[PDB]
């Protein structure tokens, strides 16, 4: 008939990929990096403590100048911080208080945010008047917004909990592309360092590599036992690290199509809310919900650091574009800026 | 510097408006409005006036924010910790669903489908100390329907008596036994009536009592 042999060819074509992943898996990244020395115990101290948010911080994003950073909280405020001098540049009141994501434009002119109202609002930071106003509100998603990320001042890609990603055009305000491959809620995005690709991980325990120009999923990466909560690209753009409710982080490779490392420990049993790399790709930072960030040696899979300054769930974390600092926002209403001491 | 000491005093005009708006927001009452769908969730917001639908109904010098989440067709476990610090949860259950079954795949009879969701919300880890203002909506619209068919189609281990004021007692106790956290929080139960004032006065009466027991626990008295 016809009801079964395409279901069995989807079984066949999923057998077509698995041993083709196995044939290209002759050794492990642990064995090839078995000769290198570890990075040592990475000690970082809280340089700055950014305070003024009055509820749980849900997202933060740095500017590209490595000094300004936007942070989102559910007291209804979007705050641009000066990270050097701990002082506020702007505080933006939002329409909906249910903001789950925030983004900084790579030019600095715009800040996006979205959440449970199913729209990504765009904010003009540099106006001829002295305020910050909403330029566009991008409606068209059916589920909550999980991640907004700018390509440039006119293009932004969003993620949503209606199992779809979308590429928008901020001038006209409508989706030029829709990215429909996921079956669960999509929880995070990460743009490549050339912005011709991106990766999104979802609650169906899979992450998908998408083409921005064509609109089609290139590769789909499995390997997790629960919802993927955080995606970050490696600085090469040829790898990406995930973070799940599985209490595990996995490093995938695009040109080898499969999972290389697995960043886990015996005592950790709680989820991973945030994933970021450092400027070298040598350290992997990961925010957990047993209230502390854990710096992972990305090549040796050893917990080579701990950032233990937060009283609640470490909710967001990012590293600057020059790798000089790392901020961690959290549910105890504080962003802490950490730096290694000479 | 001269221009960095004006950047500092702008930044503590940011700060004294963040502090001023965040203390006018800790005074208002936040309320989730959950339910099972068509279980009277619109006639309560009709008495108090595409993602969240926030509704504001300041009643007796008490600003009430009521967040309806019924249009979120996603996994509830991914966004429900946003409502973790919330004053109460207003739960609506239609009493006129004690006989009609769920039409999906001949499922449970649509009050167990509500009991799927009352147990999941009450015993949740984010709502381990959040009082629930439980509403039993269609009181008159099943009282004429309980005289035709008894209260045995859903709960077969009922005592009997086939009438209203034991079905109004057995069903109410059949929801308040799902509270497996009884020392931490309370379930308040109401029957939704045609009186336009008695249904918002119960939300004002029951949420004053959440504020008391929060102010007793924040001190040493609890």
């Amino acid at each position, epitope marked *: 008939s016809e009801l079964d042999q395409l279901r069995q060819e989807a079984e066949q074509l999923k057998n077509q990929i698995r041993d083709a992943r196995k044939a290209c898996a002759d050794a492990t990244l642990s064995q090839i990096t078995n000769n290198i020395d570890p990075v040592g115990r990475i000690q970082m101290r809280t340089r700055r403590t950014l305070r003024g948010h009055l509820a749980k911080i849900y997202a933060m994003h740095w500017g590209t100048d490595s000094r300004l950073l936007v942070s989102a909280s559910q007291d209804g405020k979007l705050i641009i911080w000066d990270s050097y001098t701990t002082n506020k*540049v702007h505080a933006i009141p939002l329409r909906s208080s249910w903001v789950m994501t925030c983004a900084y434009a790579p030019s600095g002119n715009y800040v996006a945010c979205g959440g449970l109202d199913n729209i990504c609002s765009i904010y003009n930071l540099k106006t*001829r*008047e*002295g305020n910050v106003r909403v330029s566009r509100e991008l409606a068209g998603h059916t589920g909550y917004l999980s991640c907004c990320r700018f390509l440039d001042d006119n293009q932004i890609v969003t993620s949503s909990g209606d199992t779809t990603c979308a590429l928008w055009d901020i001038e006209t305000g409508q989706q030029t592309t829709t990215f429909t491959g996921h079956t669960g809620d999509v929880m995070s995005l990460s743009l490549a360092p050339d912005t011709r690709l991106f990766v999104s991980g979802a609650c169906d325990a899979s992450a998908k590599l998408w083409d921005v120009r064509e609109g089609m999923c290139r590769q789909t990466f499995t390997g997790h036992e629960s919802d993927i909560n955080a995606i970050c690209f490696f600085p090469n753009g040829n790898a990406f690290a995930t973070g799940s409710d599985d209490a595990t982080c996995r490093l995938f490779d695009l040109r080898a199509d499969q999972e290389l490392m697995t960043y886990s420990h015996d005592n950790i049993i709680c989820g991973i809310t945030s994933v970021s790399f450092s400027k070298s790709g040598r350290l992997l930072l990961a925010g957990y919900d047993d209230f502390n960030c854990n710096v992972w040696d990305a090549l040796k899979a050893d917990r080579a650091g701990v950032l233990a300054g937060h009283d609640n769930r470490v909710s967001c974390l990012g590293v600057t574009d020059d790798g000089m600092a790392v901020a961690t926002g959290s549910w105890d209403s504080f962003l802490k800026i950490w730096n290694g001491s000479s | 510097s*001269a*221009e960095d000491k004006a*950047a500092v*005093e702008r930044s503590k005009m940011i700060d004294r408006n963040l502090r001023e708006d965040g203390e006018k927001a800790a005074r208002e009452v936040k309320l989730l409005l959950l339910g099972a769908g068509e279980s009277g969730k619109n006639t309560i917001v009709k008495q108090m006036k595409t993602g969240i639908v926030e509704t504001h109904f300041t009643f007796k010098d008490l600003h009430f924010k009521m967040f309806d989440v019924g249009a979120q067709r996603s996994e509830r476990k991914k966004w429900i910790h946003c409502f973790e610090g919330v004053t109460a949860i207003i739960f609506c259950v239609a009493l006129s669903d004690y006989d009609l079954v769920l039409a999906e795949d001949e499922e449970m009879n649509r009050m167990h489908e509500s009991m799927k969701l009352f147990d999941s919300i009450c015993n949740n880890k984010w709502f381990t100390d959040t009082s629930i203002i439980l509403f039993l909506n269609k009181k008159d619209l099943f009282e004429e329907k309980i005289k035709k068919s008894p209260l045995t189609i859903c709960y077969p281990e009922y005592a009997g008596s086939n009438t209203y004021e034991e079905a109004a007692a057995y069903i109410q106790c059949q929801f308040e036994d799902l509270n497996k956290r009884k020392d931490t929080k309370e379930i308040y139960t109401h029957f939704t009536c045609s009186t336009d004032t008695k249904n918002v006065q119960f939300v004002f009466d029951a949420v004053t009592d959440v504020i008391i027991k929060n102010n007793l626990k924040d001190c040493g008295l609890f």
Partner: single-chain antibody
Amino acid sequence: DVQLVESGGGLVQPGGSRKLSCSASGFAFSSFGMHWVRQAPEKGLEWVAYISSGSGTIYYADTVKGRFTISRDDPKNTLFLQMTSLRSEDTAMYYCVRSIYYYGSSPFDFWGQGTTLTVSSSDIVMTQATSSVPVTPGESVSISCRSSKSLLHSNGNTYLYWFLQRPGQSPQLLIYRMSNLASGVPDRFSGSGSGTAFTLTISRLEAEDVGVYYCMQHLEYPLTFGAGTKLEL
């Protein structure tokens, strides 16, 4: 458009008193610090007063301190300057300048149209040793300005500003903090310098680049201008 238009004054006897009033329109007045900058007839600019956003910090010039007082009312978007004991060195055209200070902002960017006042009958010195340059279009000019104290600061930026008063007009900001071009300024203008000596470079002169080119510092109050450099055509 953003609009600052000031009124009040025009003729007053010496020893008298006049209240100036700048009425703002088209921007968020409460977020800007406001200055007054006056200009004596056939002379240069000099700074008068300042109030921060929120009116919690007031400065004055040492020439007018005690006599003048500056105030705002943000629900009415209006800037005031109450002047008592009006001397004969106070006859000037008074400008109303808006100014915002956060990280990366552009202060002194929009100037008012200027009201005139006619009265009948230590710090940083900014020197522009050139007062006038003959020039034709197509030329590249490099206007220099010198400061007594070093304008570079420890936080890393050099607080030198550049302005252009076209004839019959109000000054417009060209360069803020010695190197950053203002909004709406063509790319021909370019500022540079180091610490004590600075130069402003125009690449190709047009029919609109003619006026007086002032340099101002913002390192500490008082804000001292230079005597401007005229570019005649």
